[PDB]
């Protein structure tokens, strides 16, 4: 499942 940081989804 992607993680959101500061509006953007990324791997983690």
């Amino acid at each position: 499942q992607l993680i959101n940081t500061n509006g953007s989804w990324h791997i983690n």
Epitope: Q1, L2, N4, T5, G7, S8, W9, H10, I11
Partner: antibody
């Protein structure tokens, strides 16, 4: 099934602080992303911010100096604080959940109206 | 800031007519093989309901007459053959580019 419900005063005075709470049932707020969205009468939806499952937050830049989103996992609630309100903050306020099943705002509260007026 | 522009802003159609609504993003809303562009339906006085997620996925419980298409900066919501209950305002929403935003809405009116 998850259910979200907004609560708080329906009238706030200019210059004062708007507070709302979203009480969540049927799901723990230790999963997902917990958002506040608003809609001025007859206008488009506006995203304001979230608090995530971890307590991380993400706020709309234009609101940053005025907004806080907080939570209490014992009460399974999260809350919006918006300082120094003006007539521009009159709106229907919604809480909404994003789950990773869709990466979309897939579950919404019913909304609560707040009018900024003396 | 990123802007989502919907077209048209309003439309009138008869029951059974095809409906096509477009949403153009000022920059790509894609990431990791997904398009983070979602479509909502809002009926008078009610919260928006998710119709389509990640550009092309029909949300559970939504009628199959609804579909979404598109990639990058250009997206389309289609209602194949309108039902009377499709009267609503429709919004696109992007949640991968800071700041998150909605389109300005498209009002669907039903002719009869």
């Amino acid at each position: 099934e998850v259910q979200l419900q907004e609560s708080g005063p329906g009238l706030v005075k200019p210059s004062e602080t708007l507070s709302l709470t979203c009480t969540v049932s049927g799901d723990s707020i230790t999963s997902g992303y917990w958002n506040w969205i608003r809609q001025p009468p007859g206008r488009a939806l506006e995203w304001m911010g979230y608090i995530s499952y971890s307590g991380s937050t993400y706020y709309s830049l234009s609101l940053r100096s005025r907004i806080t989103i907080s939570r209490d996992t014992s009460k399974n609630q999260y809350s919006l604080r918006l300082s120094s309100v003006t007539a521009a903050d009159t709106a229907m306020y919604y809480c909404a959940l994003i789950t990773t099943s869709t990466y979309a705002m897939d579950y919404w509260g019913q909304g609560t109206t707040v009018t900024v007026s003396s | 800031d990123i802007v989502l522009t919907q077209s048209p802003s309003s439309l009138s159609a008869s029951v059974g007519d095809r409906v096509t609504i477009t949403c153009r993003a000022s920059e790509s809303v894609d990431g990791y093989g997904y398009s983070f562009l979602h479509w909502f339906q809002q009926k008078p006085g009610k919260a928006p309901k998710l119709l389509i997620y990640l550009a092309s996925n029909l949300n559970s419980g939504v009628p199959s007459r609804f579909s979404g298409s598109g990639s990058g900066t250009d997206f389309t919501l289609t209602i194949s053959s309108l039902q009377p209950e499709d009267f609503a305002t429709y919004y696109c929403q992007q949640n991968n580019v800071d700041p998150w935003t909605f389109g300005q809405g498209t009002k669907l009116e039903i002719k009869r």
